[PDB]
């Protein structure tokens, strides 16, 4: 059950690169690909994200319309570990236009990328599906990313499709036209992804600014929370244990209805030598200020929830905490889905933490995020502002209208069940 990782665009390539670094450390793989871990656990499911001179190579394909981002990764610490042939980029760049990526200047490279993917999928003994990282509000990963997803779905319609999509935010914005690109991407994902982890570039900032007390968070700061969250969700897949989660089972248990495949990640300790108590981890995990999506769970209701606790800790005390939360917060849990919350414990703790907790929740509150994006789109789209940059590529206002609508429907759906 190999997972073909795929990272596109600047943001996608930056966060994906750290994700590899982090999970390589945890799995005791150094930049050269050799292994030096002290426990076999590390090598027991390493094939989920690595392929083996007894060296593990990440099963990752890097994609970009400009060399710069991919060249930095190559120069990065683990730049060696990434397979050179898996590097796949062009020179045109996407000028931050979904169009330029999903239509004009991506249709070229997309084929090249599908070839590497095909090669990775062939070697895979049992292809679990595909993992993708991108920023819904840019050009290559917003637009070209959703294009590759569609292509991928046609070739591999029996595989799980999961995306770590980085929702753009005014607090951390690059261009006025970022809402437009997000709305188009959102609708692509609604239809061609089974699982999407919404990482709001807003929240991350907040967390950093407020909690972590960082006046001028840089993109690295946000990326650091992102890599941690990533390792979290991916733990059960990487490391063996009682619950050997897989993409399909993950979708089967957390997705009551297809369109509703957007999840609010949460992590604690938000970074330290004082290991938190199992009660502490459990209260922070569900803490809004510890969720990477900028939505209040109290404003909606948890369809489904899944927790993981890495590190040595009392399994019983863990179960007790979870039970308490559910019982004290019964109103925030859908009644129609019995037992909608489940927890799992991994012995290997995150890097540099004695113990942590990762939260994955399909809350109706997630609609807040899409409402924000929809309002922005509406603001500009009501006056057709900046639309010429897309109409120049051959797009049509109607297509903007459609995507706008769909994202509103999705918002409605989350509310329906909320009430």
């Amino acid at each position: 059950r190999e997972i073909v990782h795929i990272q596109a665009g600047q943001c996608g390539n930056q966060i994906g690169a750290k994700f590899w670094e982090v999970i390589s450390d945890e799995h005791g793989i150094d930049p050269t690909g050799s292994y030096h871990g002290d426990s076999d656990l590390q090598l027991e499911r390493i094939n989920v994200y690595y392929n083996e001179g007894n060296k593990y190579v990440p099963r990752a394909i890097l994609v970009d319309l400009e060399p710069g981002t991919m060249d930095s990764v190559r120069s990065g610490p683990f730049g060696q570990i990434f397979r050179p042939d898996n590097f796949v980029f062009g020179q045109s760049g996407a000028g931050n236009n979904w169009a330029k990526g999903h239509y004009t200047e991506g249709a070229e490279l997309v084929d090249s990328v599908l070839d590497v993917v095909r090669k990775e999928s062939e070697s895979c003994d049992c292809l679990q599906g595909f993992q993708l990282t991108h920023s819904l509000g840019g050009g290559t990963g917003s637009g070209m990313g959703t294009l590759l997803i569609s292509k991928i779905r046609e070739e591999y319609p029996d595989r799980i499709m999961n995306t770590f999509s980085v929702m753009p935010s005014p607090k951390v914005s690059d261009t006025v036209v970022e809402p437009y690109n997000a709305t188009l991407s959102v609708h692509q994902l609604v239809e061609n992804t089974d699982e999407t982890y919404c990482i709001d570039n807003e929240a991350l900032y907040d967390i950093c600014f407020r909690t972590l007390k960082l006046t001028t968070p840089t993109y690295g700061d946000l990326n650091h929370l992102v890599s941690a969250t990533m390792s979290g969700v991916t733990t059960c897949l990487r490391f063996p244990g009682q619950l050997n989660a897989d993409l399909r089972k993950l979708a089967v248990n957390m997705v009551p209805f297809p369109r509703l495949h957007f999840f609010m990640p949460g992590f604690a300790p938000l970074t330290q030598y004082r290991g938190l108590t199992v009660p502490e981890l459990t209260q922070q995990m569900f803490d809004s200020k510890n969720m990477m999506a900028a939505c209040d769970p109290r404003h909606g209701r948890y369809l489904t929830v899944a927790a993981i606790f890495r590190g040595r800790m009392s399994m019983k005390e863990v179960d007790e905490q979870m039970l308490n939360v559910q019982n004290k917060n019964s109103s925030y849990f859908v009644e129609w889905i019995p037992n909608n919350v489940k927890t799992a414990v991994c012995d290997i703790p995150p890097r540099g933490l004695k113990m942590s907790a990762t939260f994955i929740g399909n809350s109706t509150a997630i609609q807040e995020l899409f409402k924000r994006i929809s309002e922005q789109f509406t603001a500009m789209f009501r006056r057709k502002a900046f639309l010429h940059w897309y109409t120049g590529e051959g797009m049509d206002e109607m297509e903007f209208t459609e995507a706008e609508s769909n994202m509103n429907d999705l918002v409605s759906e989350y509310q329906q069940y909320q009430d």
Binding site: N253, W336, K342
Partner: protein
């Protein structure tokens, strides 16, 4: 006469490995399969030959097949101590599991592997001179356990027709790991196998789990604990087939003695005494004591209150130092101080089998060896309580049609949910008619 056991899903396999281990310890067969006690090298018609076969080398091989849609579990058997014991063909693994989906294991993945498993079963049947039936062990929640099992039930009902088949299903427990869609899977597989199953013993992980916390003082029972306790219970039931006895000596005797009506083929099990091996000295419970413990819900494998249900049949199976007089005395005492009521169409009686051989506990297990034990198999309407619960759950999800799509996507149709749910609803009415006055 021989019993081919079939293990489907993780549970089945797991529990299986356990049952077969206990069987090899009871029957003094070494892990190599070489049984020193056995003097019929590669032959004989002894009682234990019902579940084992003697090779020309003198090794004995269980007459069962371990099969799962994923391999990692059955690979453990292949790499386990009893690895030699089991023949590779007996071990049938696949590439991908049903990912917790009845429809996925029954239709999508069921068809691909159904014939291969039927072939293996058939190779076993051919080696058997007179197959008594098949013992299927599985779990309601998992999608291999439910989907693929129910498909194998229909096939075995067709290919082996007459031969009898006893179930050993694992009712879903929220405390224990469980998928959210497990109530769906449970109803579906129930409905499909309801006519393919001669007698179904359910084991609620919720009950087994608390029993391990309570008697064995285990804070977080692992599957291993739970499976060991279950194996002790299976061994008590399978012991009439594996040893010489007049009670339940063939699979038919279980249905004849315990199942009055085909739909009500689910008998509640209760076992005593469960003692912690960590305790150095344990009070030796009497025949009357163990006998009475059988009438306590804590010692039931499926929580439910028999006081509010009529009995259709009851059988007590003692293992250890137990005499008929003790049993009669305990029965009498308990009857006077117990709220035991049998249906009118049934006589108030208890078929008692006693095996002089004492209970067998695995070395280093958390179960302390006892000098006597009893396991009571009684068909009470109270078991229908466990149906209700599951049913309720289903409903709550099915009203929103939550998680249905997945199944529908596997080719299944939304109507089948209603069919299976009606059938459970009938089965719940039947229980209430037989018992509720």
């Amino acid at each position: 006469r021989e019993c081919i056991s079939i293990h489907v899903g993780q549970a089945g396999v797991q529990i299986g490995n356990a049952c077969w281990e206990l069987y090899c310890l009871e029957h003094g067969i070494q892990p190599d399969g070489q049984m020193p006690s056995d003097k019929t090298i590669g032959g004989g018609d002894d009682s234990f030959n019902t579940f084992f076969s003697e090779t020309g080398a003198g090794k004995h091989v269980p007459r069962a097949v371990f099969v799962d849609l994923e391999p990692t579990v059955i690979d453990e058997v292949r790499t386990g101590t009893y690895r030699q014991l089991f023949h590779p063909e007996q071990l049938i693994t696949g590439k991908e599991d049903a990912a917790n989906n009845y429809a996925r294991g029954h239709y999508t993945i069921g068809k691909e592997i159904i014939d291969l498993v039927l072939d293996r079963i058939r190779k076993l049947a051919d080696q058997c001179t007179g197959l008594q039936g098949f013992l299927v062990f599985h779990s309601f929640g998992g999608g291999t356990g439910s989907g693929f099992t129910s498909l194998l039930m229909e096939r075995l009902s067709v290919d082996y027709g007459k031969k009898s088949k006893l179930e050993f299903s694992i009712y879903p427990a929220p405390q224990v790991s469980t998928a959210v869609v497990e109530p769906y899977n449970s109803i579906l597989t129930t409905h499909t196998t309801l006519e393919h199953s001669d007698c179904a013993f359910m084991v609620d992980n919720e009950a087994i789990y608390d029993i391990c916390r309570r008697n064995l003082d285990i804070e977080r029972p692992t599957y291993t604990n739970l499976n060991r306790l279950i194996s002790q219970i299976v061994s008590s039931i399978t012991a009439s087939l594996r040893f010489d006895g007049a009670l339940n000596v063939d699979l038919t005797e279980f249905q004849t003695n315990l199942v009055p009506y085909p739909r009500i083929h689910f008998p509640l099990a209760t076992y005593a005494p469960v003692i912690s091996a960590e305790k150095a000295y344990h009070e030796q419970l009497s025949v009357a004591e163990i006998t009475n413990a059988c009438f306590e819900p804590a010692n039931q494998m499926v929580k439910c209150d028999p006081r509010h249900g009529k009995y259709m049949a009851c059988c007590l199976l003692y293992r250890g130092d137990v005499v008929p007089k003790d049993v009669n005395a305990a029965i009498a005492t308990i009857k006077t101080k117990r709220s035991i009521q049998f249906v009118d169409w049934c006589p108030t009686g208890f078929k008692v089998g006693i095996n002089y051989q004492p209970p067998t506990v695995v070395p280093g297990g958390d179960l302390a060896k006892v000098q006597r034990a009893v396991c009571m198999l009684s068909n009470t309407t109270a078991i229908a309580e466990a149906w209700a619960r599951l049913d309720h759950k289903f409903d709550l999800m099915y009203a929103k049609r939550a998680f249905v799509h997945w199944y529908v996507g596997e080719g299944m149709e939304e109507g089948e949910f209603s069919e299976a749910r009606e059938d459970m609803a009938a089965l719940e009415k039947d229980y209430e008619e037989v018992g509720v006055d």
